[PDB]
């Protein structure tokens, strides 16, 4: 009906709705506005599988998937489609069954099976270009599907790690790594195994190309920048007309480099600009970086305006806090630290609930107490200062009885109220934090642990896309890349022959998996009992 | 085999500390520093004492539990430092923008978070009415909440586990 | 009807009948 601007629709609308569900994977379907009906479709099984999964018929969708090639890619897009058609369900009761589709389970089960035998082939399968779904890789499809449980699989983590070390020993002591990093001479020696003057140059490239090394470099450079900024803020801050210095200029240029690197990361990593901009908005850390650079830009105005000498300086101080919070992101890699950050991030009910719980009692308590002690106060700002300072200071042992106790310049009521507070907030705060922490923790023990892995994968891809030069040195790599573009991995796929063998091998693996599942079904105690009962009944009737 | 155990190593550190401290009697000028070294050696021996407890059926498992919990040191040192140093830098920036002594700034910025936890809040140097406030109050509240729930809780979930 | 217990009981009864008859 919208396009107009027995049923009326045709394959055109099916293609359009599939595009709406998946942008890159399956856009080209049924291009050639329709094709001659006499022509048989290029690949039937996929069409039937799609038809089944749309009409929400599981036990047939499985069957169609069975005899279809290239299955691990399908059983993931299918999960994406069903999980998508949840916000579009008119009836809630139905909305539950389809929300129980668990198509992803097939993806996991098959991937495990193929991973069991010939892993060097399994990795080839994992990032091979897909012939049918408009030539997209499995990983992209998992991202769009947002299948966290798939990332949680061990094969995914093994492959991610293999990428993470570039061409180096998978495992190497952290100290040995630091030693190889600090001194280039140690690199030439065989401290750790290295994957296979020009020889020295290739070794140098192999060392500096590995992601982990770029990661460490960005870490140390970020520390450097933080320290220089802290020094400038501490002592360099001076009156705007005669307050900036060459060091301030260097810091400003450093910030210009940082923001340029962030723009490169955001926009040049994505058909339309609006699409890439949405991708950039998606993550939280990018947003925090944006807030940081905004704060810096607005603060830089301080040097220009003499009178606002102090306020802009304060803005800079806050920007320092912002960068310090930015630092936390780094921690994600470590196996131990990460889950803690995941746990504290998941616990976001506390802010809202506790702000209410503290305010409702504190403001009323302060109003009542100030009513008792001094009934004549004519200053709104002084009352604000007092009523703010009292609950802010009474928690931390600052109890000025010289202004509250007539014997020290209504008492027992104040004591009773303070006791009620120090009991109910105490038991109420730590306890709720903790029950939820355990449950929130426990929730994190499963789902946020999976997120940690999800976070690890995201970080891995991010650092892979970065060039070797540090934030202050990016000014050369970005310029060189732009110059090369003006002058002029996962994506790589094999040839017909090579690939075909892989496809056939995967097919055989799927068949073995299904036969094994059936065999396990045969030995169900229930099945044995039923067969036994049937045979006994037959024997009885015959005898 | 001797290097293997930890207690042997602690004993080695103890005797090393004692040997280096004994040099104090020889050198007149270093009268105080060597004495301090001896004082630390006392701490070392007191820690050495803990090993004895292993035999008892009740006590032992407690020492085992506290020894296994070694993530807290690293994680919490980071968690405290990252916030404390930045908070101190920002607050000292607000209160007194003209400080020319690195050691005095060190003393102040060290003493403040070290003392604010234990009820030592010198408002005579922080409150203009007692010689920017509300931001400091908000940050201190955020700290005393997130570190509180974060510390004991993590210690405890991990302690249980 | 499909309780494992029910299946077992029916089976035992039929076996006993078959045994007595045979
Ligand atoms: Ca970024
Ligand atoms: Ca010994």
**Centroid of chain to Cα A481:** 28
CB contact under 8 A, B75 and A385: no
CB A127 within 8 A of CB A92: no
In which residue are the tokens 């000292």 written? B92
Query: How far are the Cα atoms of A231, A304, A424 from residue A301, in angstroms, in the given order?
Result: 19, 5, 47
DSSP secondary structure of A474-485:
HHHHHHHHHHHH
CB contact under 8 A, A529 and C14: no
Residue A149 burial (10 A CB sphere; 0-12, 13-18, 19+) = middle
d(CA A304, CA A248): 13
d(CA A195, CA A168): 5
Candidates A534, A542, A543: best to mutate against C (most CBs of C within 10 A) is A543
Query: How far are the Cα atoms of A61, A80, A157, A441, B14 from residue A150, in angstroms, in the given order?
Result: 20, 12, 10, 21, 53
d(CA A78, CA A104): 8
What is the CB neighbour count within 10 angstroms for residue B8?
12
Assign A6 to helix, strand or coil.
coil
d(CA A329, CA A288): 11
Question: Which of A158, A152, A184, A156 has the alpha carbon at shortest distance from A447?
Answer: A152
**What method was applied to determine this entry?**
cryo-EM
d(CA A381, CA A111): 66
d(CA B90, CA A314): 8
The phi-psi region of residue A379 (left if phi > 0; otherwise alpha if psi is between -120 and 50; otherwise beta) is beta
Residues of chain B whose beta carbon is less than 8 angstroms from a beta carbon of chain A are 71, 75, 78, 82-83, 86, 89-90, 93-94, 97, 100, 105, 116, 119, 121, 123, 129, 132-134, 137, 140-141, 144-146, 148-150, 152-154, 156-157
**Centroid of chain to Cα A203:** 33
Question: Which residue in the set A313, A320, A441 is minimally distant from B89, CB to CB?
Answer: A320
Residues of chain A whose beta carbon is less than 8 angstroms from a beta carbon of chain C are 526, 529-530, 532-533, 536-537, 539-540, 543
Say what the resolution is, in angstroms: 4.2
- What is the whole-number distance in angstroms between the Cα of residue B5 and the centre of ligand 2? 9
Residues of chain A in contact with residue C11, where contact means CB-CB under 8 angstroms, are 529, 532-533, 536
d(CA A171, CA A162): 10
What is the CB neighbour count within 10 angstroms for residue A539?
12
Question: Which of A242, A222, A244, A224 has the alpha carbon at shortest distance from A316?
Answer: A244
In which residue are the tokens 């499909």 written? C2
Q: What is the largest CA-CA distance in chain A?
A: 114
- What is the whole-number distance in angstroms between the Cα of residue A462 and the centre of ligand 1? 8
Q: What angle do CA A406, A423, A340 make, to 5 degrees?
A: 130
Contacts of A506 (CB under 8 A, 6+ apart): A69, A70, A71, A72, A114, A125
The residue in chain B having the minimum alpha-carbon distance to the alpha carbon of residue A229 is: B89
Kindly tell me the sign of the dihedral angle through the C-alpha atoms of A433, A439, A443, A448. positive
What is the CB neighbour count within 10 angstroms for residue A383?
15
DSSP secondary structure of A52-86:
HHHTT-HHHHHHHHHT-SSHHHHHHHHHHHHHHTT
**What is the distance between the terminal CA atoms of chain C, rounded to a whole angstrom?**
28
Question: Which residues in chain B are followed by a discontinuity, with C-to-N distance exceeding 2.5 angstroms?
Answer: 131
d(CA A444, CA A343): 6
Total count of residues recorded for chain B: 161
Kindly tell me the sign of the dihedral angle through the C-alpha atoms of A48, A54, A59, A62. positive
d(CA A156, CA A171): 17
Question: Which residue in the set C4, C7, C18 is minimally distant from A540, CB to CB?
Answer: C18
Residue A142 burial (10 A CB sphere; 0-12, 13-18, 19+) = buried
Q: Own/partner pairs for B9-18, CB < 8 Å, 24+ apart?
A: B10/B44, B10/B47, B10/B48, B11/B48, B13/B44, B14/B41, B14/B44, B14/B45, B14/B48, B17/B41, B17/B44
């Amino acid at each position: 009906e919208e396009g107009r601007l027995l049923p009326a629709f045709s394959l055109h609308e099916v293609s359009r709705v599939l595009k709406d569900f998946l942008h890159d994977a399956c856009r080209g379907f049924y291009q050639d506005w329709l094709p001659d009906l006499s022509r048989k479709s290029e690949d039937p099984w996929r069409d039937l599988f799609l038809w089944a999964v749309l009409q929400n018929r599981y036990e047939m969708a499985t069957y169609f998937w069975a005899m279809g090639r290239e299955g691990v890619a399908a059983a993931l897009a299918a999960c994406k489609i069903i999980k998508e058609m949840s916000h579009l369900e008119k009836e809630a009761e139905v909305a539950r069954t389809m929300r129980e589709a668990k198509y992803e389970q097939l993806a996991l089960d098959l991937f495990s099976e193929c991973y069991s035998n010939s892993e060097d082939r399994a990795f080839a399968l994992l990032v091979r270009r897909n012939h049918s779904w408009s030539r997209t890789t499995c990983l992209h499809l998992a991202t769009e599907a947002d299948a966290k449980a798939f990332f949680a699989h061990d094969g995914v983590q093994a492959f991610l790690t293999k990428i993470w070390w570039g061409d180096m020993a998978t495992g190497t002591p952290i100290l040995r790594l630091l030693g190889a990093f600090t001194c280039p001479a140690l690199i030439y020696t065989n401290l750790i195994s290295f994957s296979e003057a020009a020889f020295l140059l290739t070794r140098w490239r192999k060392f500096w190309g590995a992601p982990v090394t770029v990661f460490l470099g960005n870490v140390v450079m970020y520390f450097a920048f933080l320290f220089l900024f802290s020094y400038v803020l501490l002592v360099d801050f001076r009156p705007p007309p005669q307050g900036p210095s060459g060091s301030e200029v260097t810091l400003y240029f450093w910030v210009f480099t940082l923001v340029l690197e962030e723009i490169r990361q955001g926009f040049f990593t994505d058909t339309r600009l609006v699409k890439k901009f949405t991708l950039y908005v998606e993550d939280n850390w990018n947003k925090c970086d944006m807030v940081a650079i905004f704060l810096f830009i607005v603060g830089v105005t301080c040097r220009m305006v003499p009178s606002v000498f102090e306020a802009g300086r304060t803005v800079l101080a806050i920007d320092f806090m912002v960068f310090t919070l930015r630092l936390i992101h780094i921690f994600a890699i470590h196996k131990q630290l990460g889950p803690k950050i995941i746990i504290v991030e998941r616990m976001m009910k506390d802010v809202f609930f506790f702000l209410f719980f503290l305010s409702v009692w504190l403001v009323a308590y302060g109003v009542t107490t100030q009513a008792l002690l001094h009934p004549h106060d004519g200053r709104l700002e002084w009352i604000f200062r007092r009523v703010l300072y009292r609950p802010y200071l009474q928690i931390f042992g600052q109890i000025p009885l010289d202004e509250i106790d007539e014997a020290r310049v209504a008492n027992w009521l104040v004591i009773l109220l303070l006791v009620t507070f120090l009991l109910v907030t105490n038991v109420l705060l730590m306890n709720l934090l903790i029950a939820m922490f355990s449950y929130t923790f426990q929730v994190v023990q499963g789902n946020a642990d999976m997120f940690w892995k999800f976070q690890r994968y995201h970080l891995i891809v991010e650092y892979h896309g970065r060039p070797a030069l540090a934030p202050p040195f990016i000014l050369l790599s970005h310029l060189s890349l732009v110059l090369k573009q003006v002058f002029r991995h996962l994506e790589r796929d094999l040839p017909d022959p090579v690939d075909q063998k892989i496809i056939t091998w995967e097919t055989v693996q799927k068949e073995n998996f299904l036969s094994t599942m059936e065999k396990r079904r045969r030995d169900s105690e229930e099945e044995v009992l039923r067969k036994t009962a049937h045979r006994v009944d037959l024997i009885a009737k015959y005898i």
